[PDB]
User: What shape does this take?
Amino acid sequence: RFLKVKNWETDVVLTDTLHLKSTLETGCTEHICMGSIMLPTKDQLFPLAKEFLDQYYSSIKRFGSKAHMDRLEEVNKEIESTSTYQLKDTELIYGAKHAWRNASRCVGRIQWSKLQVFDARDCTTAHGMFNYICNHVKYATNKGNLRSAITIFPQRTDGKHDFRVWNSQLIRYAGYKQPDGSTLGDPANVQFTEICIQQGWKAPRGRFDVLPLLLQANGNDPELFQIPPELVLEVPIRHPKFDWFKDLGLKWYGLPAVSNMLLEIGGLEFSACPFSGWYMGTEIGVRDYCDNSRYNILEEVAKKMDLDMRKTSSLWKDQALVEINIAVLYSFQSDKVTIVDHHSATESFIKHMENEYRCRGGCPADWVWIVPPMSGSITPVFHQEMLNYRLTPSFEYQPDPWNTHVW
Amino acid sequence: RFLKVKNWETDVVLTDTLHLKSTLETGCTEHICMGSIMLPVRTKDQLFPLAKEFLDQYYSSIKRFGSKAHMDRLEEVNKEIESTSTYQLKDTELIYGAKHAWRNASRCVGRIQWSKLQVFDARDCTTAHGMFNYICNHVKYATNKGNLRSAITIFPQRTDGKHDFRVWNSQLIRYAGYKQPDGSTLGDPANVQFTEICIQQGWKAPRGRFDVLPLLLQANGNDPELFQIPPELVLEVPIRHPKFDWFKDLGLKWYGLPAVSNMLLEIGGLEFSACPFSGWYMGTEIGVRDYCDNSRYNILEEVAKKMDLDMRKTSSLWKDQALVEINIAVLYSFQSDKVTIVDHHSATESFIKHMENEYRCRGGCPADWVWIVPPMSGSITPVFHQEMLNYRLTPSFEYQPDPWNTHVWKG
Ligand code: HEM
Ligand code: HEM
Ligand SMILES: Cc1cc(N)nc(CCc2cc(F)cc(CCCN(C)C)c2F)c1
Ligand SMILES: Cc1cc(N)nc(CCc2cc(F)cc(CCCN(C)C)c2F)c1
Ligand SMILES: C[C@H](O)[C@H](O)[C@H]1CNc2nc(N)[nH]c(=O)c2N1
Ligand SMILES: C[C@H](O)[C@H](O)[C@H]1CNc2nc(N)[nH]c(=O)c2N1
Ligand SMILES: [Zn+2]
Assistant: This one.
């Protein structure tokens, strides 16, 4: 019940007791582990508020204080009358930073306490939403010296008045299918690129066309807005050694900014809460460029390197994969845009685990997602046992709006 | 109840009913996932239900469920248990059991081969010397001059856990590891503890970097005894690189036959505590883990040096670069010497095909994603994108504690 996790590269053992404050469910049982499955009212709301407020006031060392019981009473009262309640700004910031702290799949959480929270709960319209998101983007980008941020739009009420950003990220390239066969641009975004045109977008039909924002306020029809190009920092991808690399015409955007998740604090649901930080190198080079259901450029890069592509045992895919990722990091670093390589980030996370066990009693972690998609075992997280459990406040997935909107 | 797994690269979706025939626990609960944790004397009482479950399965596979042969075998096993407190497996049942234990190994990516296992019944064995002979014939047969064949040799089952057969080596063939007084390690750092045991048991250690360890064999619960595998039976491959002539000068070699010998085979409630098994290598087992783990030979540095790489900042990905060439070299050497080996792209693709076939003909295929995904280039292999259900079927291979921690010494 006071569990241990071993690191097998160093024999360091940590005792996890934070897990006993777990709440939500894992999807697993004693008969079946689902650790690799991608996606498993007034009476319920007050215990949720209490749990949150109790830990908020513990963190500020006012557990069982006048201000504690008074806030408990105050929120209790507001729930009894309004059937919801509003977070004090301080609680909003704590709840947001801790939803990140608890993101068991995020390798970048050593930064968790430095999150910039932008309270957009006064927002009423998609134009307003657009204004906030432009401000988010410019602040986060910071001329390439990226800064973590989240912008929190009004909380759900009756599910009919939801605020949603329909894009999965604030900044993504469009996906166009071809009359002759495959796909131009980003295949992952092909359907969304439809719903943009199919909602009135005029596509440049290029390969790296920044998608427009599709913002939904108070449950209304969503609206298209183009992010000012001067706010969208991009890096052209070149190699420090192969001058033919530039001719592939590759570039990526500097700001990863997840916009389609749901943030839960003390029972309240924030359906629009775009958050952002900075890329780990492999997200772009391994996944964005080389996944088969993505830009899948491996075949062409290896040809340009004149590698024996006839048998898998030459490991030509592996060789190319390493070059592509050397180039991504090389390009971001050259243009002074923040980026972290997977060796540095996983090492940082080990340090961060150390600290969370030491000052919090544990750190929920999803090995299937922490371990980078290349060179796994030469990173320290590979040999690190992790315990996965759902703490709250949290980010959670939510249905794609086009399936849901009472249109 | 039915359960669905999806492949996020191809949208193929599969329906698992086989998890319904699941027994032993996972370690997980609805509130904790232990999916990445490495490690998650039996009476007449619980034994016959375990036997009956196994015999039921066995007779279903041969399409004789409820037959007179089936019913008489149950009755015979039942009476043998109450009479003798255990029972013996027929040859046919032992073969089925071992094949299905492999088939059920949810961490094994090589399971497409599961039905082709060569089973060696060593249940008539009684002494360590007899164990040595059986193991020598396993190594000769499985090796096959480089054209490797999968095999398992099954020694007598446990009785009161005071008379266990155990192979004390973790693998039949493994290199020695020596801790030096200066703190560095000569040879394989994984094998230092076992090497000391051998040295203390009387092994004359050549104290080289690639010394094949002696077999340390325990029969019927007696003290273990040392034996040297004849060197002409140990097939080895010198590691060279197809473009880098300096690679041969690193002096590296590896043995050809991976043969796991410290696990426990469970069949119908019987426990076979010595059951060495062997197949052939995936290239990354040697090139990524054996050479490049920090707690192993750790040749990344010296390969990086000789390649002349920017070793100053990790964001040059010099480690990744060196790792790929080392794995190119392992595959190249083994193919050049016509020793069976599989690269990780080939093996993951085969597993996916195996896995789908298992869903269609069996209703599922338990799989441990954490272990199935290769330790390099994970996402460019198809298992990365494969959702997988993990659960425990029997027959099974289980871990067991190292015998030197439990054995009671005679003298
Ligand atoms: C600052 C540097 C950051 C780095 C390097 C980083 C890195 C990563 C990586 C590699 C993943 C795996 C997802 C994938 O591969 O598609 C991930 C997931 C995630 N990140 Fe972080 N991230 C950072 C910042 C943030 C911030 C600021 C937040 C929120 C405040 C956040 C929340 C999450 C969540 C919730 C997930 C997992 C969502 C899920 O369950 O799918 N991250 N991150
Ligand atoms: C024939 C080709 C085979 C290949 C390519 C192969 C490959 C692998 C690999 C790469 C692992 C991961 C273990 C690690 O990386 O440390 C593994 C695990 C395993 N393999 Fe296979 N294997 C093969 C044959 C066999 C055979 C013949 C058996 C038994 C009859 C077997 C039983 C197992 C078991 C029980 C595990 C579980 C390991 C554990 O839980 O620690 N394998 N295999
Ligand atoms: C803030 C941030 C930092 C970073 N460095 N990187 C990312 C992108 C990784 C990511 C984070 C996340 F929270 C959700 C998704 C959606 C994918 C879910 N799966 C179904 C594919 C993501 F891609 C986000
Ligand atoms: C039959 C076989 C084929 C293959 N191609 N490769 C191997 C070696 C991989 C392996 C398989 C196994 F069943 C147990 C261990 C010991 C590791 C135990 N850990 C807990 C430290 C292994 F290394 C075995
Ligand atoms: C902590 C973690 O479970 C441990 O390092 C595991 C991870 N996955 C693995 N996968 C394989 N194939 N082999 C291993 O030794 C391991 N080790
Ligand atoms: C099937 C499996 O769950 C799926 O491929 C997961 C595996 N691990 C991952 N890890 C990261 N970081 N990102 C991902 O999208 C995934 N996908
Ligand atoms: Zn689990």
Q: What stands out?
A: Chain A touches chain B through 63 residues (CB under 8 Å). Residues 234-256+279-344 of chain A form a domain with the Bovine Endothelial Nitric Oxide Synthase Heme Domain; Chain: A,domain 3 fold (CATH 3.90.1230.10). The first strand of chain A starts at residue 3 and ends at 6. Chain A is about 30% helix and 15% strand.
